[PDB]
Amino acid sequence: PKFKRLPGHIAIIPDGNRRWALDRGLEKHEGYKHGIVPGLELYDICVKIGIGEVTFFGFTQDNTKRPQIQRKAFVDACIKSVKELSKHDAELLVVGNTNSDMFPKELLAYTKRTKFGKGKVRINFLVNYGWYWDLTYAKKMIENIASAEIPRIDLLIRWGGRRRLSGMLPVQTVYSDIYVVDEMWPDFKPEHLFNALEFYQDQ
């Protein structure tokens, strides 16, 4: 589909993976592996329509306090997503608290933005991320927040039906238009993104 106006930078909150799994009769931790292909599909659509920058919420510092079986699954799914995007022309950046045992060592290779292939889209991941860590990391202070290499967000899209930011990038979300999909993240469809983009061009 054709759009009159496109956001320069979209933020994604891929919430609802545990509810999705429980609804399918799987264990709570089994939804995250079903969240990988939706991200790659979203990326593909963004390359096709020409979105310049996408930031995914991977996991928060609070999420690390979840049951180990869940953490290992969502961490493994974040690593696989990043690794897979590095094979398909993403310019990748991971932002999160690397001074923590909970930062996945496999993503230390991505903490300075790295072009893969043609670098068709800037893809950012928040991993072991907290708003408070971000702001206090730090007028040099605001330009020096931990997420300073992630620019202002135009459109934030959240799956899972919760209408909240969960502390995603408070500086970059000040003026973001927010679109909520009721379906859980693993039920992602191209129409969810097209509906958010219709909403955005109407603002």
Ligand X SMILES: CC(C)=CCC/C(C)=C/CC/C(C)=C/CSP(=O)(O)OP(=O)(O)O
Determine if 96 is a binding residue for ligand X (CB under 6 A): no
Question: What is the C-alpha separation between 100 and 114, in angstroms, rounded?
Answer: 22
The residue range among 3-11, 84-92, 105-113, 160-168 that interacts with ligand ISY, by the rule CB under 6 A, is 160-168
Q: Is the Cβ of residue 12 or residue 120 nearer to ligand ISY in the bound state?
A: 12
* Residue 89 counted as an annotated binding residue: no
Mask for 39-78, x = binds ligand X (CB under 6 A): x----------------x-xx---x----------x--xx
| Strand ranges, E, within the chain | 9-14, 53-60, 90-95, 114-115, 121-129, 155-159, 177-180
Report if residue 134 touches ligand ISY, rule: CB under 6 A.
Answer: no
Comparing CB distances to its own copies, the nearer of 51 and 168 is 168
What CA–CA distance (Å, rounded) separates 1 from 168? 29
Residue at token pair 């330009």: 143
Place of tokens 């009769």: 25
Q: Which residues are annotated as a binding site for Mg(2+)?
A: 15
